[PDB]
Design a protein around this ligand. Structure first.
Ligand code: CYZ
Ligand code: CYZ
Ligand code: CYZ
Ligand code: CYZ
Ligand code: GLU
Ligand code: GLU
Ligand code: GLU
Ligand code: GLU
Lengths: 260, 270, 270, 260
C-alpha cells in the first residue's frame, strides 16, 4: 500500500525542481523535507507518494467553523496518512493530530531590511512608527492570539487592529513586501526561514533581536494512526546518527550564496 | 493517590535549601525542576512527593546483564510514576519509557579551565588550547571524559562519526579513568586539574557553572549535537498525555522561559 | 448610591479614546486619573460615573464676586462628590474643600520652544536664551504667561518674592494677553511663536509634552516651587478619610509610581 | 497653656546648639525643625516648649503587644500635643495619628563608600557580597516589611535573616558603621539625610542610584486634636510663601562644608 504524504512548498524544505516539467514521481521534488521523507520511508520500510496541499497553508481553526485547513485538515479528515513539513508543534494541534519529536528547533524572529533602532520585540511594541506583520493560518498569529504576557497582548492588539491588512498570504510574499517597503515594514517569521532568507542572495534583509519563544517542527500523523511510533523512532534515530544536522547543513549552509 | 516523582540532585535543577535541616517534605528542595513539578501538578491534579534516586544515576544499561539502572531503570520497574528531571531524550530510552515534548533544549559541550590573559599595545586577549571537538581528539596533552551512566557516554559509544569514534576510542582505553561519577566531580576535576582535563557535559549545566563564582571555567566551541530534556513516564501510563499537554501549555505561556531566566541568568555573577 | 467623579480632559491624565464615538459610560476615557479612580473605587467600594467639568477650568475664586468656578467650584456647590484629577493643593482651596495626601509631586516649570543645535571641533551644542526665572523676568524679548484660572496664576498673583512679583507685574499688564485657556493651547502658542513665548506650567505636563512627538519643546531650569496633586472632596464629607487611606495605600503599594512610569516613560517617542 | 512639642535629635532638623549647657528653654535648640516649630507657633499663636523624646524612636508597633514607641507613642498616649520632626507619613501611622500636609519631600536612597557596582536596587539586591541595613524602628524597615513587590520582598528576606544584626539603633551609628566598613556596608536611609550627610565634611560617603519610592515628612497630632487644622493651614501657608524652601536651603546648602 502507498502512503500519501502532504507537504507545503517551503524553502529550503520542499522546492520545485528546475527541470520539474520533464520530471515525474518523487524525483520531481527536492529539499530538506523530501530527503526527510525518503529517510523516513527507508527506515520504516514503506512506499510513499509526495503530494502538495491544495491550499498553501499549514493549518488553523477557522472563525466559528471548527474546520481545519492546510496539512492539519488533510491529516484530520483522512485525506492524508502523514505530513513531513515545517509544521510547528502547538497545543491546539497535538489535541487533534499526533506529533513526533521535534526534528528542528526554531523560534519567533523579526526580519528587517537593511544603528539598529529596533532591537528586541519590546522596543518594537513600544514604537509604532514601523508596521509589522505575520503569516495567515500558521503558528505565529496563533501564538500571538492566545498569549497571556501583557507585552505580547499589546502586540496582538496592534496586529488585529491594523489598517490595511498586514497578514500576508505566503512567506515569500512577506519577504517581497519587506524588500520593497524600504525598511518601513517588518515581518515576523520563524528562525529557520529567517536565516535561510537573510543568508541567501541578495542578502538585503537581516534578523534583529533574538527568539521570542522556543518551538520545533514535528512529523504529524493522524490521531490514532499506527505510523506515529515508527516515525517518532525514525526521527530519534536520525537525530542520534546526526543525519538531521547534515541535512540542515546541506540545505542551509553548504551553498552559502553570500559573503559571510 | 500520591505519585512518587523520581528526580536527581543537580543544580540549578534540584538543590537543597539553605535551611533544609529543619525543613521537611517538598520544601526541602529548590530550583528549576521543583517549580516544573509544581506547574505539572497544578495543570493536572495529583499529589506528588519529591524523591531522589538512591544510586544518583541518570540511566543506562549494565554490563552483560541487560538491566536498566538509575532513573530510567527505577521508572521501568515501577518504583516511580513520573520523572520530572533533566532526563535526556534518546533512542534507547524511548523504546522502554515514554518521553514528553522537550521542555528545554541542550547540546553536548566542552568545559575547560579558563586560561589566563595573554598580556603581551595594552590589550588582554583570551587564548585557549582547545577550540573544537576535532582538535581535542587530535591533541593528546589534554585529557577529556564524560559522565558515566549518562546520555553523553551512550552517545559517544554508538557514534559513527570519525571524530566522535576516535574520541570514544581514546576515552574507553584511557588510563587513569576519565569518566566521573557526578557532574560536580567532573567540574572539580576541571577546576583543579591545572587545565589538563576537559569535561564533556550538557550545555545548560556548563553555562550555569560558567555564570557563577568563582567562574574559573569556560565553554569552548559550539554544541556537539542537539538534544532536549523530556519528562519520562512508563509505557502505557495514564500520565503520559496529560503531562505532554502540560509541557506544551507551559511552553506556550513562556513559564519555561521565565523559569530558565530566573534560575540561570538572574542569579548570575562575574 | 452612585457618586459622580469630576475630571479634566488633560493628557496623560484623562484622554479621549480613539473609539469613543460609539462608547457609552466610563470606557470613553483613558490615561492616569481614570485608573487612579478605578483603584480608589476598588479600595472603597462605590459606583462612579466619570464627568468632565463644564467650563474646563481647574478652579479659582472670582474677585468682587466670591464665587468659585471650575472643578473646585462645582465641588463646593454640591454638584460633585469627588474630584479625582490633577488638582493642585493650595492654601485657598483647602479652606473650602478637603484635600488628600498628594499622589504625585509637581513643580512650576518653564516651557520654551526647543532651539536649533549650534554648528561649532564638530560638536553640536544646545544654547537656550532662558535658563531660569530671574533672567526670564529680567529679559523682555520673550513673552511668558500661565494658564487662566489655574494654580500657577494664583501662585504668581499672591507671590511676595521679588522675581515672582516682577513676573506677575509683567503678566498682569501685557498686550496682547499672555494667559491661556488650556494647556494644549499654550503649548501650541509656544510651538508657533518661533521661540518668542515661554509657557509657565506644571513639571509633569511639561515633561510629558517634551517626551512625546514632535519633540519640539524643551524645559529650561528647575521647578519654581514644590507642590502636589490631591484628590479633592467637599468640606465635611464622609469620603475624605477613606480616600486618604486609599491614596496612602496606593502610594505604599507602588501603584502610583508604576502608573506614572507606564503613562509617562513607557511611551517615549523621542 | 503650654503646648508640649516632641522631637528627635536629628541633623539638620534638631541640634543641641554648641554650648547648650549654658542655655535653657527653647534657646538651647537649633535646626530646621526648631525654626519650623517657631513659625508654627507664630502662625497659630500658642506658647510651646521643645522636648526631646526619651527614646530615640520614630515610631513602630512592638512584638505582638500593640504598643507605640517614641514620638508616635508620645502622641497617642497623651504625652505630647504635637510632634515637629522628620516623621515619615505612613499608612499605618495615619490610622492612629493625624498627619498634616508634607512639608518636605523625600524617598528611600542608598548611601555607600566613595561607576558604582550596585547603583540600582535590583543589582544591590542581587549582589550579596555587600551587606545592607536600615534604621531600627523607623519607616524604611516598615516599608520593606509590607512590600508585596518581588524584588523588595527578596531584599526584606535578606534583611530579616542577617547575621549579625544589620539594623542600627541610630542613623548616626549607621553612618559610623558605613564609615568603618571599607565599603563592605550599605545604608538604606532617606534622601534628605543622605544628601545632608554627603554634603558635609569629610565627604567620604556618597549616594548612589535613584529613589525607591516617594514619601514625605508630616507634622503629627493626636487623633481628634483641635490643632491639626491650624498646623495644616500653617504648613500650606509656609509652603506657598516659600519659607520651607528657604529653610531647607539654609540648613542643607547655605553652609556647605564639603568640596563640591
Ligand atoms: N540543529 S537542528 O535545528 O537541525 C536540530 C534540532 C533538534 C534535533 C536535531 C537537529 Cl539536527 N533533535 C531533537 C530531538 C531529539 C531528541 C531530543 C529532542 C528531540 C528528541 N529536537 S531538536 O532540539 O529540535
Ligand atoms: N529557551 S529554553 O531552552 O528554556 C526552551 C526550549 C524548548 C521549549 C521551551 C523553552 Cl523555554 N519548548 C519546545 C517544545 C514545544 C513545542 C515545540 C517543540 C517542543 C514541543 N522544546 S524546546 O525547543 O527544547
Ligand atoms: N514619583 S511620584 O511623583 O509619581 C509620587 C509622589 C508622591 C507620592 C507617590 C508618588 Cl509615586 N506619595 C506622597 C504621599 C504619600 C505619603 C507620604 C507623602 C505623601 C503621604 N506624596 S508625593 O511625594 O507627591
Ligand atoms: N523642596 S522641599 O523638599 O523643602 C518641599 C517639599 C514640599 C513642599 C514644600 C517644600 Cl519647600 N510643600 C508640599 C505641600 C504643599 C501643598 C502641596 C503639597 C503639600 C500641600 N509638600 S512637599 O511637595 O513634600
Ligand atoms: N511552520 C509554521 C509556519 C507559520 C509561520 O510562518 O509563522 C506552521 O506550521 O505554523
Ligand atoms: N542529562 C544527561 C546526563 C548528563 C550527561 O550524560 O552528561 C541524561 O539525562 O542522561
Ligand atoms: N494643575 C493646576 C492647573 C494648571 C496650571 O495652573 O498650570 C491646578 O490644579 O490648579
Ligand atoms: N524618619 C523615618 C525613619 C528614618 C528611616 O526610616 O530611615 C520615620 O519617621 O519613621
Amino acid at each position: 500500500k502507498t502512503v500519501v504524504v502532504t507537504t507545503i512548498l517551503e524553502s529550503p524544505y520542499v522546492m520545485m525542481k528546475k527541470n520539474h516539467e520533464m520530471l515525474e514521481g518523487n524525483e520531481r521534488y527536492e529539499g530538506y523535507c523530501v530527503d526527510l521523507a525518503a529517510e523516513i520511508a527507508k527506515h520504516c520500510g514503506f512506499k510513499y507518494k509526495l503530494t502538495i496541499v491544495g491550499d498553501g497553508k499549514y493549518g488553523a481553526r477557522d472563525a466559528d467553523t471548527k474546520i481545519w485547513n492546510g496539512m492539519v485538515g488533510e491529516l484530520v479528515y483522512g485525506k492524508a496518512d502523514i505530513a513531513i513539513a515545517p509544521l510547528t508543534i502547538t497545543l491546539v494541534r497535538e489535541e487533534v493530530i499526533d506529533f513526533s519529536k521535534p526534528f528542528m528547533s526554531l523560534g519567533i524572529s523579526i526580519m528587517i531590511k537593511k544603528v539598529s533602532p529596533i532591537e528586541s520585540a519590546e522596543d518594537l511594541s513600544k514604537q509604532t512608527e514601523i508596521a509589522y506583520g505575520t503569516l495567515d493560518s500558521g503558528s505565529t498569529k496563533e501564538f500571538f492570539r492566545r498569549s497571556k504576557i501583557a507585552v505580547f497582548d499589546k502586540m496582538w492588539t496592534y496586529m488585529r487592529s491594523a489598517e490595511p491588512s498586514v497578514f500576508v498570504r505566503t512567506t515569500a510574499e512577506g519577504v517581497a513586501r519587506v524588500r520593497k517597503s524600504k525598511g518601513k515594514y517588518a515581518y515576523l517569521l520563524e528562525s529557520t526561514m529567517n536565516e535561510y532568507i537573510e543568508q541567501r542572495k541578495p542578502c538585503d534583509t537581516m534578523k534583529v533581536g533574538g527568539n521570542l519563544d522556543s518551538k520545533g517542527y514535528g512529523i504529524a500523523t493522524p490521531k490514532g494512526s499506527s505510523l506515529g511510533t515508527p516515525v517518532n523512532l525514525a526521527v530519534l534515530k536520525l537525530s542520534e546518527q546526526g543525519v538531521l544536522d547534515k541535512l540542515k547543513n546541506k540545505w542551509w549552509y553548504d551553498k552559502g550564496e553570500c559573503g559571510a
